[PDB]
Amino acid sequence: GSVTFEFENLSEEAAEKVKKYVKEVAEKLGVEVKVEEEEGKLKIYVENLKEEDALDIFKYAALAAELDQEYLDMVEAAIKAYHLFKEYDENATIEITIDDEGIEVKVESGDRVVTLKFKNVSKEEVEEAVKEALKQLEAGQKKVEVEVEGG
């Protein structure tokens, strides 16, 4: 499977690190990689990966990007989510987005749409929401929306 990773508003220095270290990882794994950078914008496309690889690389890109722990937690949360949904449907379209407010997960799986949005939330909470979403899908629900805001 092929995967795209995107960063907005990294410093030049940080983006350079991401590029360099994504390259290294990929060539160590013998896989094709496309990196695109404009002002404020970095995008990485890797093409035929075992999921486990993909999720490793994404994690290291984030480290290389010098993101703080709150961002890193959400990255790990996103890791768990991507996995669990792929376990349900290997052909699900999964878009996970992280920013300074929180995290948002969009899944399209056959004719099933799932949207999960979180602000100021623990990684644990996200997992639990994902498992619940999957329960609903498993019981035949077509659409599941979840929204959570820490207090």
Partner 1 sequence: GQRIRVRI
Q: Which residues contact partner 1 (rule: CB under 8 A)?
A: 1-10, 58, 62, 65, 67, 71, 75, 78, 82, 93-100
CB 96 within 8 A of CB 81: yes
The CA–CA distances, whole Å, from 47 to 30, 32, 115, 135 equal 11, 6, 25, 30
Q: Which is nearer to partner 1, 3 or 26 (CB)?
A: 3
Minimal distance, residue 23 CB to partner 1, in Å = 18
First vs last C-alpha separation in the chain: 38
Q: How far is the CB of 140 from partner 1 (least distance, A)?
A: 26
Residue closer to partner 1, measured from CB, 77 or 137: 77
* Comparison of 68 and 139: residue with beta carbon closer to partner 1: 68
